[PDB]
């Protein structure tokens, strides 16, 4: 577990996306945010200065795993070309023409299982399943429609927003086949998915994250 910050935003997940084989960060501001990942990731996996539709919220406009990456229609051809160049052939890049461009919020997924907004058409669901090679299910966390913003998942474990009920927690844990814990991040923030980015060996959250929150994140994700 490592503490970092955007220019001044503690919602790391909004401006960055982290996976087991690649990471994405916003280009705005300075390289202080970029260097934070280097301290922990170094050059083991690529780190790409990429924008999506000209926004700095690439962490929420895109979703993917070590096997593939997805971008919305608003992404310009230049951004797609840069992403293709800056990532290995083992990481697929597929443009998505879905109605809901918020892939990062609509889709919450790990290397094995994925959750999507039920409004997503079956065609895009099949595309996500094929590109990412993961099981895709239509589910919500205790009525939270945006699974990608209220949930965080990884091969080691996952974390959901505190309002999740015990029955919902059990159902989601059974479906995703990984341990889950209901808690807050960034000093009581309920948007766990957007607050922090986590992978199988590295969790990055905002400075506001309290020590109990960091300990819970480490324990659930088995980072130490």
């Amino acid at each position: 577990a490592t503490r970092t910050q955007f220019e001044n935003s503690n919602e790391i997940g909004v401006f960055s996306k982290l996976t087991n084989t690649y990471c994405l960060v916003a280009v705005g501001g300075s390289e202080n945010f970029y260097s934070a990942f280097e301290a922990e990731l170094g050059d083991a996996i690529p780190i790409v200065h990429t924008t999506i539709a000209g926004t700095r919220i690439i962490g929420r406009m895109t979703a993917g795993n070590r096997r593939g990456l997805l971008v919305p229609t608003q992404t310009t051809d230049q951004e797609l070309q840069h992403l293709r160049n800056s990532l290995p052939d083992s990481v697929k890049i597929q443009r998505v023409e879905e109605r809901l461009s918020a892939l990062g919020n609509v889709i919450c997924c790990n290397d094995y299982v994925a959750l999507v907004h039920p409004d997503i058409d079956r065609e895009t669901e099949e595309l996500i399943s094929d590109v990412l090679g993961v099981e895709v299910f239509r589910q919500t966390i205790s009525g939270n429609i945006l699974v990608g913003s209220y949930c965080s998942l990884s091969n080691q474990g996952g974390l959901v927003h505190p309002q999740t009920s015990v029955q919902d927690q059990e159902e989601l844990s059974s479906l995703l086949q990984v341990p889950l814990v209901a808690g807050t991040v960034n000093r009581g923030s309920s948007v766990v998915g957007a607050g922090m980015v986590v992978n199988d060996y590295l969790a990055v959250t905002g400075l506001d994250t309290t020590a109990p929150e960091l300990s819970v994140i480490e324990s659930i994700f088995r980072l130490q």
Partner: protein
């Protein structure tokens, strides 16, 4: 710019002056918002404060759950419905002007946002983007 903004604000056309009615876009139970003032606007003689996409305004709920009426809380405009200059080089406008209610810290009252959300508002407000299922 008020608290919660993570960057400079683009110069865009003024869509909603004081007293403009904008539809709600969150599950907080409110349906319409009445703008009484615009935060960060420099008042000048004869010039009615006006907001735009991504702006934070103070409004009182006129229709919806009565519990939210008669109280003024900060609101963020998600749709402008007036053509504004996008740096990509397109004069785009939304079908209907709409806004969302949030605290000064930028936390969204509603767990999720419904309908399209302007890029210039989602980008400036991380919480809006996180709680928005559609961008542009």
């Amino acid at each position: 710019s008020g608290n919660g903004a993570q960057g400079t604000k683009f110069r865009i056309s003024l869509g909603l002056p004081v007293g403009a009615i904008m539809n709600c876009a969150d599950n907080s139970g409110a349906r319409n918002l009445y703008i009484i003032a615009v935060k960060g606007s420099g008042s000048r003689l004869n010039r009615l404060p006006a907001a735009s996409l991504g702006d934070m305004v103070m409004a009182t709920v006129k229709k919806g759950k009565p519990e939210l009426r008669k109280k003024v809380m900060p609101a963020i405009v998600v749709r402008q419905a007036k053509s504004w200059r996008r740096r990509d080089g397109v004069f785009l406008y939304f079908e209907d002007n709409a806004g969302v209610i949030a605290n000064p810290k930028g936390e969204m009252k509603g767990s999720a946002i419904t309908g399209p959300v302007g890029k210039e508002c989602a980008d400036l407000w991380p919480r809006v983007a996180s709680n928005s299922g559609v961008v542009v």
